[PDB]
Each structure stands twice: as structure tokens, then as C-alpha cells.
Symmetry: D2
Subunit: 445 residues, 4 copies
């Protein structure tokens, strides 16, 4: 049996050490009485769309921030990231004839898991930066001491962001007639921009023809659903935002539509798995090179006992060099055991190079190579390459090398070469979308 | 005041001389108690679509036989002609973003007006062939004597043909997923066929995208309306099939959705105008080189006194050499007097050459030139080039010269070089449709 | 293996003796080249709706003439009969929340099976009247001698009637806003009329609310499909109108959407079964008191070998006194053998009394009692009471006794007390519809 | 010319005195960079729906809190209030055949205008309570001193509330199949509950019939738009949340879809009018007994110079005794000057009795009487009674007397008898909705 607090009896990784247990417990009670970010009905609806993807009838697009910050809390940033998602989605939808389920790493992607629990600079040692929901990026004691009030500031940033996203998605901004306005102005003067603009023209023509057929007022052309997801890492936050469905009594983590377990916190006897075990949300697990096939099946026994087809997303991040070698055996096990899973590629977290200095690089060529091999492996095994899961930005930067143009080492993107990881820019997100699109067309031909 | 028989008190052209007035009157009473081909509601609906065309928001496609015959009464022929109409319609609809109103010269286009009321072969003189509804094509007395029973045979051919057309249109045959199946198998191995096939592919993609958007079950994609029209020439037929609307009391000629007055029977004091004066149908008049602008306005005063915008179609057939010279002055008059009319081009009946032998030729190059000039003239005057009105066939023939390939002088098409006129084949209908389509796109750009 | 003519090698009942085999063969060739009444696509669509009924997700309404006549060939009669069908359909649809599949015994219900092959009046003996498609009702030699030309007159009446029905159904007459106009003016001044008028008001309110919700332009509210059916009795007619589907090569009897085998012609080794064996249409068989359960299963093996769920309608006509006793055993056999069938009640042909004089009576109370027991029997056995199959008229008569008002013995209805059977009038059809409606609501509650 | 800060140069009522101008200015800059509650596109859409109401084709329902509080910030409270709004809306929509535009006094209704700028208790005098966005209800210095940080707490409560409302409205909670679940469990055991339950049953039947017609998947049945409104009283808040539309450059107050000017702050030369003058939102003005017809027209010249038909809502709150006397002359002036306005009744703020003690009472009988007279007055003058504007709650209380049951003087509702006003409960909101509904039906009959 399970409760929202049953995770507290399990062994646990990646949790901060709060200096005042009582203070933390008061912030948790405050948050427990605040309204949920999502309504349980919607999580059920996302499960229904996951099941469509799992059965080969749609494709999952999951994208957004590496970690949202308090210092970057702007309408512009939320809008631009959502623009890139819509662009990708329409490119894939039109070229492949395939519904795309859109899920943003947004409105609650704050907590960060770290390779080390502390950090050392010239003889001074401080707790590690774990994301703004926990503590601050500044290398100094007041910054790094965990502050339970940050829970509430993360929540407030999240209701603001999701409120705006829901407005954009339902209120006209995502209407297919807006197809051109989704292109950020810095995608121009290149074969790729020309390419989007031509596809957009084709969409204009499609809608004009639908209008001439008598379908101009269909609500389906004017609005779309956008869902939210983050890593369920800080379980105090997740617990306070877990709520019983009014109609059914069943527990849902209402911090987000979908939650996932990170690669370093997926211990089968651990707290993170125990949390997600007993919520009704669609969920995901990060599947990196350390996962073997026995371990994977046991994990699925726990996270999806009834083998429901819209429950579990397996998010494969292996490295461009390792996916060929590791994935086949994992799929084969799932097929053999008759499991229903949604297979996604995270082509980014397995392709990060750390220099001795701590400076992080991601070669976009390797990101593409992992993706291409993901699809090849599915192709060979008879299973379905079901989704993509990327870190990206609508800001005019270049954080991943070996793209089309050389990188920007801005300072605005220094956070994304040290404490966070390099994100795809809009050029890169779009080229990815076109590659996915051709590949999907070929699968379905 | 007006009745279905008020035409009988007017002077009249092009009527046959029946040998037994009483016998004719009995066939007329028989036909008067038979069911109507169309229901008044539908004629009102066509008026509504005419008004859309008249206002520049749609385009009228009217096509079919020169004159239907009793010897060519086959499902195959009806289907193939309707295929060509759907092809044309979709080509225009997709490329121009414009609804097309589809009207077939079918299910009652039997009566034919003739330049002479008799015919002479080597010293023997016989009444002229006036179409199978009147008499027979054979040069012999029994054939040429008007037979009132032929009224009923025309009616029976008409209910059969329209029944089938309504079945095709509503029952799945006209569903947009059928776009490829409308291409007749003899349109192939040419840039034009390649062109239709590419447009059809674009339509497949549009529908697949609509499916992926959640619109796959829209009834608008699956069915279309098809309307019928003929020249109201034999007024005995027309009267017997004129019926009062159940709800409103108002008279409708229920032989067809739309009726038109031919160029030789449009005398303002004449029977034909008097007939159509008092029916509620959408109607048309043939406007050839002999029409002046004073005459045209008076005709419109009679045929559309209330200046209703879906009532009157002006069907301009001038000759490739004469349209430039004649049309401008006609449009200018209408504009000046504020009249609402639907302007169509009949590019065929003004471009017929009669050799001394009676053998008829139509150069397709001239057909295209009249069309191009029609649009140019509208362009120059500020008015709307609203429709096309052609004779065509889905049979694998070539009756009009100077197309892409040289003609067929079959014998199957000898009727269409003597008593009837050469029809456009499917290649020719399609090239026309593509020209119309580019022109409409340019008008609306 | 099967052909359209393979029935001619089988033993056969109820066929007329034509006096000139050659003449008959010429009329058959004429008819073979005439267009079909229906298109194969539509027959497939009706199979799809039958499958919905068979699975308990819709209800089948089949109604129309006992036998159409040449003397009663009027738009008014076709319209009024169709009005009664729409009335019944909407009453059932609204009160029961259940789609109704609408099938008219119209546009080809001409041939009649007879208890005797001749008739005797005061010493003179003549071939029996077999319906106007064969011969004439007049007791005299010229009338009664089979005339093959009557085939063509039946065909022409059929294209006229179906053309009009398709017009009504698609062209605005069947639009749900017309709900009141379907009530014939002689249903008034009674609790039953009041009842329809209230339901119609409820439908007005429903549509107004749909309009206020933004659904006013849905095509689903404006049009409906209407299908046709008759007894496939005169196989010469049926063969000439059997045609290969263009796309699939497969044979369809295109005289009508659905054909059925009568109770007296359902010999398993016989011609009628052999005809329908190899057409793709939805079909029916009349199941009267003489049918046993072994015989029924063998018949189904032949008529539906693949056990397709939209293929076969079993039309049960037992008598009010006999249904209780006979039906249970028939259903039990079907259930046991896993057969997919659409069960309908014909509550009329088993409830006819013939006086010594030949004068036919049908007590409406018995018609209702057979219906009520049909549903009771299904209720008891676990199967689905799937449809109703009645003879009815929109004319202002009373042919069945023991209704609400006493009968009309008009002369207009003397055909329906001798050579044909008494039909339900509109009062009676409606009361039936309300009973069916309550019963269906209760089944689904 | 106009800017978001141009109000600061005008004379102004009802503003608090902040103790630190600099601190306030910092909180304002913080809020200025936070995301907007609404997107400009949506405000334009609400203008479009206002225009529908103004033209007599819809009805405006505006309801919610008197003033939201920080202590009552729960999902339950937001949900229950929204339930009552949906109930009212559907009752009106179904019975009257009329679209209802739904606007909640929610997600930013914090600031309160007061009759006096201070309050005295037993010799101690303190600044008046102006709502939680300004200061605190507690009678003590720290509470009553204006705190600029409260701006941000109001904003955070607002994004949380609107995020949830948008979720409910779009995500399944407002789906018409939920009609029964909107009834709060304490509306039961009464003719009024029975009444809602019967209407809900009628809605079930309507949807079942739509399903049987093939419309079960229409998005229009599943989602609705919900808009937000408050009094634009604290202009510092409003300015910080005023933002330029991305596409058009035009300014919108993005704190809410609609803003209104209160009765005490509508000075034509004043700050409040100057603020709303130059935003693109739909807006309202409170029109109480002190407004004369000259004054009203000048106010409209300023607030709607172009006389756009979806711009201005006149919210009439006169008193049950005074509406008869005052409104006629106001309407007559508007009619005479050809102004397009949306006329609403606020039947509550003119019907409040203050005892010498400060204890506030509202007699529901008087609330109903003002409403009834509003409609009567419109009826007499030829204008349109366009909306209703009420304070209400989904909590199980009785704050207004003379309803059906005697009041609750809870303490939970003591805020609503002193600093705020008594709200309608759910019984009362519903009875109102049924009265409005009959009245609208009668107007449109
Ligand atoms: N409404 C459809 C199609 C759609 C997709 C994306 C959009 O931006 C807009 C519409 C969907 O959500 O799938
Ligand atoms: N139903 C639409 C679109 C359409 C057009 C042609 C078709 O063949 C099919 C559908 C119309 O009639 O305009
Ligand atoms: N179009 C739907 C609903 C309908 C039924 C009957 C009608 O008369 C009209 C509409 C159908 O055919 O089932
Ligand atoms: N979607 C429609 C109808 C509707 C109304 C209220 C609802 O709760 C649901 C649907 C509208 O917003 O007007
Ligand atoms: Cl699931
Ligand atoms: Cl008109
Ligand atoms: Cl089937
Ligand atoms: Cl406006
Ligand atoms: Co990362
Ligand atoms: Co011709
Ligand atoms: Co019978
Ligand atoms: Co108040």
C-alpha cells in the first residue's frame, strides 16, 4: 500500500540537507493547500494519447529547458520555446501524416540531479547547486544552503508559466493559420528556413482548401493541447502537489501532467520509484547505458503492474557510440515479455563531454547520430520509435557545437556549459524535426 | 401574371410541328403526373451558390453533353463525364482556394436548336433533327416526323441518369479520397497527366493531415452536391415538369435545377423568355455577338426584376475574334445599372466553323483564346469572371482540332461534326481546368 | 461457382410463364444495358450499418408498400410514405438514443408471390396476378398474360422514385428542422398527435441548443441516408440489374440496396437462394412458422458462409399466437452456432385472415401483440430485437381493423384486401414507433 | 495621447498611501517583468462575444467574489464558484436557445473601494481595509499600513486561480456530459433542485441524440471559454500588467480579460477612466443612481470614441426602488445618440442596507425585484437586457436574507457583512438563472 509520504521510508539519492526540518515542514504544509497545476482528468487524457503513440498511431515530442531559473522568468522566453515546439510539431505532423503529442519540459523543471553532492573552489567546499527550487547558483554559503521557501517561488513561477501556455495553446496563438509566426526571426537566410517557409506555405494551401470545402470553423484547426513534464526529483514538492481525484479517489501528482525518474535516481528499492508507483500520471524513466534487461523488466513490473499501454515512457539516452550496442537487448526483453511501452530517444544526456575544467560540450552531429541509430535499432527489432526528448531554447544562441554555425560562448549560456547542459537552438530543433519527419514518413510508407 | 402555359400565347422559335395535337396533349398529361427530377428546395440552394459566385466567392463549372442521345444511355458514359467534372473541380478548388459550384449538362439536355428547320439530301426534303426528345437522327420520314412519345423516353433517361449522379455524388464516389480514381486511364504519358497526379498527391497529403488533426470523419470530405441543367427549348416538356413548391406555392421548373435560354430563342417578347420569367429556378441566357447592351438590360428587367443575386447567369459566347470587341460594352452597361449577374464563358459555340459540306470544326486553341480574353476583359472592367460553360465527354476521342494530338474522325464522333458540335475530351477539359485555376489564383492573390 | 444466370439451372417457384421466350430475352438485354438503381459502394455502406444493428448499437426500420402499382405512381405518394418513415425514425432515435437505419420497401417492390398460380371466377380460369412488373390486376386474358415489356416500365418507375427519394433525403426535406412538416395533416385531434408534436418540440429545443453551442451548420443535422429494398422474386429483373463493382470485380444486385427472399421461395436448393448467394448486397430472408432450426442454420451456411455481421437479416413473421412457441428455438440455435444475424419482426404477414371470399383482414391489435412478444422473446433469450419490417402507407385510409378508429373499405384500398394485404396507416405506424421507442429505451436503460 | 502611466497625472480617488514610494516602485518593476494573466488575442475574442450580446444574439453572465482573500485560496473554492457559473449558464443556454458569455469575478478581484478612507474603533483610528492586494483586514497598524509586497502575492494567487480555471474549462470539467456534477450537493430536497435535475436530464437526452446523429466527438460539447474580470481600482497593479500586443503594437491590460470602473471612481477627468481609455480590452462601468444622461454620454465618448460594439459594458446598479425611475432616461439618451452598449444589471450593489453598526444586509427579494424591473424597463424602451452581474459563492452559506431559508451568520461570512457584501449562494444563483431563463425565452418567443 502507498501514500504520498511513503517515499520517506525508502532509501534516497540526490536530496538536499535542509538546515531546519520544522521550517521545511511548514513550507510543505503551505504548498499542500495551494491549488494543483493540473487537473487529474488531463493526466488521464495524456495517458490516452501515450497509448496512441505506444500503438504506432502518433509520435511524442517532449522538449524544453535543462532547468528553468528564477532569473529567466519571462513571457518572451516561455512563448519562444513554445513556438519552437509548435514548429517541430507541425513539421512532423504534415510530412508524416501522424498526430504529435506535445509535452513541454516547463512549468516545474527546476530541480537538478548532480554527479557530486558538493563543489570545491580553491579550498572552499559548499553544497552543490541543485536548481533554484532548492538553492542558488552563486558559489557562497547563503546561496548554497537549502532554502525551503524556494519551493513556493518554484510553484509561483510554474502557475504563471502554465497559465500562459494554456492561454497560448487554447486562445489562438497555436491556431494553424499562425504557422509562419512560429518561425523565430533568426531562422532565415538558409536552406532550412526556406524549407520551413515552403512547408508553411503548403499548410496555408491546405487550410485554404479546407475553407473552400466548408471546414473553416473547425475547432481542431484553432487550438491544441499542451502538456507539461519535469523530473520528479525533489519529492517534497511532488508530495505537497499530489492530490486525490474528486470523482475516482485515485492519487495524481498534480505538479505536472507527466513526471519522470532520472537515470541516477531509478533505484528499484528507492524513494523516487516508490513515489511514482502509486500516482495515476503518465510517467517516464531515464534509460542510460548502465541499465540491463533484467533490471528494466523488474522496474516495469513496479511502475506498470497492469501493463496499461499509456502508462510508461522509456526515455533512452545511451550515447551515439553505445545505442547500437545496448538498446537491442532491452527492446528484445520487452517484446519477449509482452510489455507495452512508449520508447523515446533522449539523444542529449548520453552525449555530453566534460573537460577536466568542468566545461560541458555537446556535439550536435553526435545528437543526430544517436537519433538516427535509435530509429535504425527500432527498424531492425520490429518495435516502434515513438518519441523524441530534447533540451532546447527559443533564445538566439548556439550552445551545442558542430551544428551549422560555430558556437556562442555568451555568459547567458555559461550556465549551460557548467551547472546545466547545452540546449538545442531553433535551427538545430528544426533540422531535427525534419529528420524525424522523413524517417517517420519512411516508416509509414 | 404567369402560368406554366402562358408561353403558348407568345410567338415562338425552334418548335417542331407535331402531326397529332391530341396525341401530343395526351403525352403531356402523362408526363404532368410523373414525379419531378428535382425538388424546389434544391433549386433554391443552387440560387444561393450562384449568389456566392456572383459576389466573387466561388466559381461555376458547367459541363456536359452537346445533346444526350437514346443510343448512348449507359452508366459508363454518365460516370466518365462526371469523373471529368470532378477532376476539373478539384483542380480549380485546390489551386485557387475557391469553392466550385458543379452543374452538369446532363439528365435532360436532349432538345437541339437548328440553323435551318429542314434538311435536304439529293432532292428529298425532311424536317430537321431537333434531338431525340423530338425525333430521330435518321434521314427518313418515320425518323423525322415529330413523335410525342419521345418526351417520355427523354424523361425516363433523365430519371435514370440523375438517380445515378445523385448516388455517385452522395454515396462515396465523389469522396476526396477518390481523387486519383477520377483520372481516366487515357490521360497518362504526358506532362498534363503528371500534373494531375501531383495535385492529387498534394490532396492525399492534405487529407492525411486533416486526419492527423482529428477531422477524418467530416461529411464535407466525403460528398458533394451535383446540379443539372439544360436548355429549356422544348416548352411542352418544361411545362409538364413545372410544379408548385409544397411549402411556398411558388412555381419551379422541376425538369432540372437550372434552365437556360439559347441564343436563337431569347426574343424578349418570345415564348422562351415568358416560360422562365415566372419560375423560381436559377436560370441562364446565352449571350452571343448579336446582343447589344440596351437589349441585354431589358432582358434582365424581365428575367430578374428584383435584381436577386443568385437568379441570372449570363453565358457569353462570342468567338475568340469578337469577345475583345463585344463584351466590354455589355459589362459596362450592367455595372452602370447596378445589376447582379453571374458571368460565364461558353468558349465553344462562338468558335465553330461550318465547311460548305456542313462538317463542323472547333479549334481548341481558339477555345482557349476566347477563355483567356474573357478573363482579360473582366480584369480590365473591374467585374468578375465567374464561370465556365463547356461541352465535353469522358469518352476516349478527339473531336476538337489543334489540341495536343490530332483528331479522331471516328463515326462515334460523326454526330458531333454534323448535327451536334465537337466536345472537349478529358485532356482538353483538364488543360482548361489548369488554365482557369492559375488565372483564378492570380485574381485572388 | 456463381454467375448472374446460375439461378436458371435451379428448381424455382412463383415464376410466370411468358408466352414468347425470345421477346422476353430481348427485354432482358435492353434492361441489362440500362443504368443501375444503386452503386455498389452504397450496398457496402448498408452492410456496415446492418453490422451496427446486429451488435446492438442501432435499430432497423424497414417499411413501405405491399406492392407498388403503375396506377399509383405519384410524387405525393412517394413523399407521404417517406414522411411516415422519417417520423417513425426520429421518434425512435430521440427517445431511445439509438441510430435508426432507414430502408424503404420502395422503388422496385412490384413482384408478388401468390398462394395459387391461377384464379377462377365463375367458370373462367386465368393466370394469377403477380404484380405489375409481370402482368395486370384486371381479370381478363390480355391483362393476365405475362408481358415482358413490364420489366422496363417497373425499372422506369423505380429510377423516378429513387431519384426523388435521394433528392428528399439529401436535398433538405429530411433536415431535422423539418420535424413538424413530416406529420401528415390527418394525424391531429388525438393523444398520439399531441404526443408527436411534443416530441417534435423537444427536437426543436435540442437543435436550438446545438445552434447556441456552435453546431448549427453540421451536415449531420441536415441530411440522412435512405436505402431501398424489395423481394427478389422475379429473377429476370434481378439478373439484368446485377453488375460488377468497378473497383473490386465483385457482383452486386444493383436493383436495390437490399434484397430479400420470401417465405414461399426460400428452398435451400432453389433458384432464389442461389441468386442471392453470390451477390454482395445486404440481404434478408422471411422466417415464418414452417422454418425449423436445422433448416435455418443450413440456409445461413449458404447465404452467409463467412458469418459476416452485416450480411443477413432474419425477418420473423410468425403470427401473434405462434411467435412465443416458435422463435425461442430458432434464436437458441443461432446463439449455439455463433451466427451473426440481424433479427427483425415482420408482424404483419403472419397475422392475415383470409375469409372464404378471399377478403383479407389484419387486426392491428394482433400486429402489436406479435411485436411485443418478439421483444419479450429476445429479452428472455439474451439476443437483440434488431428491427421492424412493416407494410404502410402515407394515404388517409384505414386498412387494418381494431386500430383506434374503424376501417375504410374504400375501393382505393380494395387492392389491399384481395390481391395485396392491408397496410398500416400513419396513426398506426406512429403508435408502433412509440411502442418500439419505449421498449428500446427500456432495453438500454 | 496615452501611456500606461498617464493615469498618474490625473486626479484620483480610492488610492492607498504607501509609506515608501521607492519600495513600491521596486515591487512595480518586479511585477512589470512577470508574465501576463491573459494574452491580447483573448481580450479581442471577448470583445467579439460582447458584440454578439450587444446585438441581442447572446447573454452575458458575470459572477464571482465580492473580494477574493489570501486566507481563502483553495482549489475547492475556485472549483465550486465555477460550478455555479456553469450551472447558471447551461440553464440559461438551454431554456433560451441563446449563447451565454461566461465571465468570472475571479483571479484578480482583490482591491475594494470604501465609503470612508479610515476606520475608528474606540478612539483608535487606522487606514481603511482596501482588500488584501493593499493591506489586511485586521484592525491594527501593521495590518493596515499599505504593503507593496501584496501586489505580488495578489498576482501569484491570480496565476494559480486562472491556471486552474483554464484547466477546468478546456480539460474536461466543463464538458456538457458533466452537467449533473456541477450541482453542489447542498442543492437537494427542494423544487429548485428537482428543477435543475430535470433540465440536466433533458441535456443528457439532447447529447445522447447528438451521439445517435453522429456528432458525439464535436469539440464544442466538451470545452468552453471562461474569461476573467475585476475592478481596475489599484492602478499600480494594472499598469505593471499592461503590455503591448506582439502583432499589433496596441496596449492591453493583461491582468484580466475585462476590467471595469467602479461607481465611486468614474470621474470623467479622473485617473481610472484615463487608464482604461487607452487599453484595447472589453471594459465596463458601474452605473448607479447618481449618473445622469449627459454625464453618461460624455463618459462613452471617452471610453468608446469609435462606438465599437464589443467595447463597453454598462453595469446598472440602481436599487429595486430606483431602477424604474432612473434607467429609462439613460437608455433613451443612448438610443437617441446611436451608441452601441452592452447593458447589464448588477442587482446587488444598489440593494445594500447598512445598519448604524456597519452590519450590511441584502434582501434577495429586492435583488430579484431589481432584476425583474431591469428587464421590464428594457422591454418598454425597445433596448436589450444583455447581462447579469452578481456576487456569489459556491460555499454552503446564506448571506442574503429573504431567500428560501433563513440566513447563516457564520463568522466565515462576517467578512461579507462588514468589510465586504453579502453574496448569493447556489440556491439563490440558480433561482436567478431560472428567472433570467424564462424572461429570455419570452423576449425571443
Ligand atoms: N487540434 C489538433 C491539430 C493542431 C495541432 C497543432 C496546432 O498548433 C494546432 C492544431 C491537435 O491538437 O492535434
Ligand atoms: N463537400 C464539399 C467539398 C467537396 C468537393 C468536391 C468533392 O468531390 C468532394 C468534396 C463541396 O461540395 O464543396
Ligand atoms: N444524419 C443523421 C441524423 C439524421 C437522421 C434523420 C434525419 O431525418 C436527419 C438527420 C443520420 O442519418 O442518422
Ligand atoms: N462550447 C460551447 C458550448 C458549451 C457551453 C458550456 C459548457 O460548459 C460546455 C460547452 C460554448 O462555449 O458556448
Ligand atoms: Cl493507460
Ligand atoms: Cl437569389
Ligand atoms: Cl458484413
Ligand atoms: Cl469591438
Ligand atoms: Co540537461
Ligand atoms: Co453544342
Ligand atoms: Co404484403
Ligand atoms: Co461587493
Amino acid at each position: 500500500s502507498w501514500s504520498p509520504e511513503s517515499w520517506r521510508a525508502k532509501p534516497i539519492q540526490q536530496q538536499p540537507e535542509y538546515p531546519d526540518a520544522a521550517h521545511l515542514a511548514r513550507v510543505e504544509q503551505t504548498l499542500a493547500g495551494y491549488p494543483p497545476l493540473v487537473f487529474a482528468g488531463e493526466a488521464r487524457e495524456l495517458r490516452r494519447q501515450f497509448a496512441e503513440v505506444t500503438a504506432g498511431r502518433a509520435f511524442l515530442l517532449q522538449g524544453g529547458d535543462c532547468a528553468e531559473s528564477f532569473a529567466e522568468f519571462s513571457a518572451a522566453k516561455i512563448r519562444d520555446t513554445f513556438k519552437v515546439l509548435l514548429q517541430m510539431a507541425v513539421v512532423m505532423t504534415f510530412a508524416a501524416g501522424c498526430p504529435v503529442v506535445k509535452v513541454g519540459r516547463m512549468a516545474g523543471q527546476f530541480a537538478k540531479p548532480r554527479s557530486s553532492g558538493d563543489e570545491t573552489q580553491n579550498g572552499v567546499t559548499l553544497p552543490a547547486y541543485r536548481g533554484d527550487i532548492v538553492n542558488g547558483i552563486g558559489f557562497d554559503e547563503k546561496s548554497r544552503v537549502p532554502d525551503p521557501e524556494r519551493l513556493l517561488q518554484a510553484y509561483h513561477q510554474s502557475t504563471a508559466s502554465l497559465n500562459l501556455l494554456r492561454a497560448f495553446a487554447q486562445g489562438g496563438f497555436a491556431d494553424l493559420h499562425q504557422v509562419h509566426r512560429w518561425n523565430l526571426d533568426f531562422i532565415a537566410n538558409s536552406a532550412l528556413a526556406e524549407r520551413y517557409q515552403q512547408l508553411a506555405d503548403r499548410i496555408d494551401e491546405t487550410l485554404a482548401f479546407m475553407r473552400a470545402c466548408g471546414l473553416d470553423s473547425a475547432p481542431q484547426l484553432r487550438e491544441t493541447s499542451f502538456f507539461t513534464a519535469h523530473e520528479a526529483l525533489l519529492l517534497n514538492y511532488e508530495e505537497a502537489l499530489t492530490r486525490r481525484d474528486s470523482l475516482t479517489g485515485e492519487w495524481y501528482d498534480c505538479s505536472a501532467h507527466m513526471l519522470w525518474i532520472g537515470d541516477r535516481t531509478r533505484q528499484i528499492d528507492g524513494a523516487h520509484v516508490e513515489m511514482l508507483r502509486g500516482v495515476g500520471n503518465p510517467i517516464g524513466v531515464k534509460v542510460g547505458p548502465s541499465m540491463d534487461s533484467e533490471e528494466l523488466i523488474r522496474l516495469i513490473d513496479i511502475l506498470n503492474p497492469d501493463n496499461d499501454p499509456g502508462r510508461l515512457n522509456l526515455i533512452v539516452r545511451m550515447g551515439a557510440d553505445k545505442v547500437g550496442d545496448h538498446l537491442p537487448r532491452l527492446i528484445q526483453a520487452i517484446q519477449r515479455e509482452g510489455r507495452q511501452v512508449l520508447w523515446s530517444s533522449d539523444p542529449m544526456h548520453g552525449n555530453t563531454i566534460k573537460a577536466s575544467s568542468g566545461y560541458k560540450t555537446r556535439d550536435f552531429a553526435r545528437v543526430l547520430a544517436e537519433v538516427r541509430q535509435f530509429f535504425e535499432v527500432h527498424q531492425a527489432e520490429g518495435s516502434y520509435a515513438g518519441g523524441i526528448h530534447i533540451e532546447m531554447t527559443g533564445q538566439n544562441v548556439t550552445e551545442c557545437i558542430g551544428g551549422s554555425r560555430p558556437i556562442t560562448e555568451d555568459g547567458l549560456s555559461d550556465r549551460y556549459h557548467t551547472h546545466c547542459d547545452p540546449r538545442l537552438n531553433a535551427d538545430q530543433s528544426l533540422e531535427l524535426a525534419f529528420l524525424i519527419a522523413e524517417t517517420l514518413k519512411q516508416v509509414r510508407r
